[PDB]
């Protein structure tokens, strides 16, 4: 995808993440765990439902039209009736093919983007207290217990509290 996260610096997806589309796994002094990220998951779901609802909205209603099957050879007028219909069908078939190609390219890119946005947001919270290991994981350079991990996950992590400890570990 365009952002290089999904099938990129994130090496693979997690079959064990069964309660969200995007999320976190951690290891700290209290063990390991996993949690779905609700906001990123819902942003992707909401965009996908948005495009689905635009696509499946409003079939056209048509009533009396032209005949499209014929039991006798007639020549010129029938030739034209059949050509008009064949022309119409080929144009709609082209629209249908192109629509799903464009939509699908974009769905892959928007989901890749949501992964990348979560990663960047997490990085920004951590400031100088962590480093990007290059595989979608952050090495956090301070003791970070379950409540600390949850503070990152819920967006209230206070980098200043841990900065002295982390810098000592990173740089000295």
């Amino acid at each position: 995808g365009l952002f290089g996260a999904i099938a990129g610096f994130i090496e693979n997806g997690w079959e064990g993440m069964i309660d969200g589309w995007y999320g976190f796994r951690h290891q700290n002094s209290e063990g390991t765990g996993q949690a779905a990220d609700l906001k990123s998951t819902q942003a992707a779901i909401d965009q996908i439902n948005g495009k689905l609802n635009r696509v499946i909205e409003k079939t056209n209603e048509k009533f009396h039209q032209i005949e499209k099957e014929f039991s006798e050879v007639e020549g010129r007028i029938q030739d034209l009736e059949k050509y008009v219909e064949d022309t119409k069908i080929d144009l709609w078939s082209y629209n249908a093919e192109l629509l799903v190609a464009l939509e699908n390219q974009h769905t892959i890119d928007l989901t890749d983007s949501e992964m990348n946005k979560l990663f960047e947001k997490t990085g920004r919270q951590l400031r100088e207290n962590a480093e990007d290991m290059g595989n979608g994981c952050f090495k956090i350079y301070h003791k970070c217990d379950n409540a600390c991990i949850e503070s990152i996950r819920n967006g209230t992590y206070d980098h200043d509290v841990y900065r002295d400890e982390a810098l000592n570990n990173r740089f000295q």
Partner: antibody, heavy 119, light 109 residues
């Protein structure tokens, strides 16, 4: 402002099945989880399960697993609950309710009017 | 069950009333609590979510809190229109499903 509108009251004989619908009007609910919650006469609320149809999740309460089928039609903006092998223990009002987001943890903030099923 | 509430609470107009909700580690302990209000024959209404968060349409006299494996709904300044059934709720990680308390009937004296 979305409203959830449920199908009408049902009278059922023992062993039969009932399928209740929940239509999201005034907007779609396809990007949210909708749960089904029942309330037996004089009793409390009881979760049956839910569905989040774009996300692709259907969940069931263990106590109803195998007897209930929850489904959705994203094109008509409708969710469904089908409960099989009915007995008098299933006489209850059945509600559909939409969660604040795509999954079942969030508070249920939009509720249907309820559907009475009498067995 | 799973969550346990007193069957009944009462108060006078203007009084402060509290409704307790006892759970376990698999629900209230590790998950967020929601509270619902229900008038007879009508659908429940969301009153509190995420433990202490209040929807904009819900009066500020309603508040919620969570400590340990317990939760509490407080109604400051009780009004007559608050006579209703109240339910606590949370996800349970052991049952892998949503659970509710048995409900508390609030009577305005």
């Amino acid at each position: 402002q979305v409203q959830l509108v449920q199908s009408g009251a049902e009278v059922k004989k023992p062993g039969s099945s009932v399928k209740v619908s929940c239509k999201s009007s005034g907007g779609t609910s396809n990007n949210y989880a909708i749960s089904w919650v029942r309330q037996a006469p004089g009793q409390g609320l009881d979760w049956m399960g839910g569905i989040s149809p774009i996300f692709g999740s259907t969940a069931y309460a263990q106590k109803f697993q195998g007897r209930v089928t929850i489904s959705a039609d994203i094109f008509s903006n409708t969710a469904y609950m089908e409960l099989n092998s009915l007995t008098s223990e299933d006489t209850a009002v059945y509600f559909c309710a939409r969660h604040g987001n795509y999954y079942y943890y969030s508070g249920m903030d939009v509720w249907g009017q309820g559907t009475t099923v009498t067995v | 069950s799973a969550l346990t509430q007193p069957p009944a609470v009462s108060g006078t107009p203007g009084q402060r009333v509290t409704i307790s909700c006892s759970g376990s580690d698999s629900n209230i302990g590790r998950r967020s609590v929601n509270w619902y209000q229900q008038f007879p024959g009508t659908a429940p209404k969301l009153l509190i979510y995420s433990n202490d968060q209040r929807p904009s349409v819900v009066p500020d006299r309603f508040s919620g809190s969570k400590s340990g494996t317990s939760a509490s709904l407080a109604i400051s300044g009780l009004q007559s229109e608050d006579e209703a059934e109240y339910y606590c709720a949370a996800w349970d990680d052991s049952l892998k499903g949503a659970v509710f308390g048995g409900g508390t009937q609030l009577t305005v004296l």
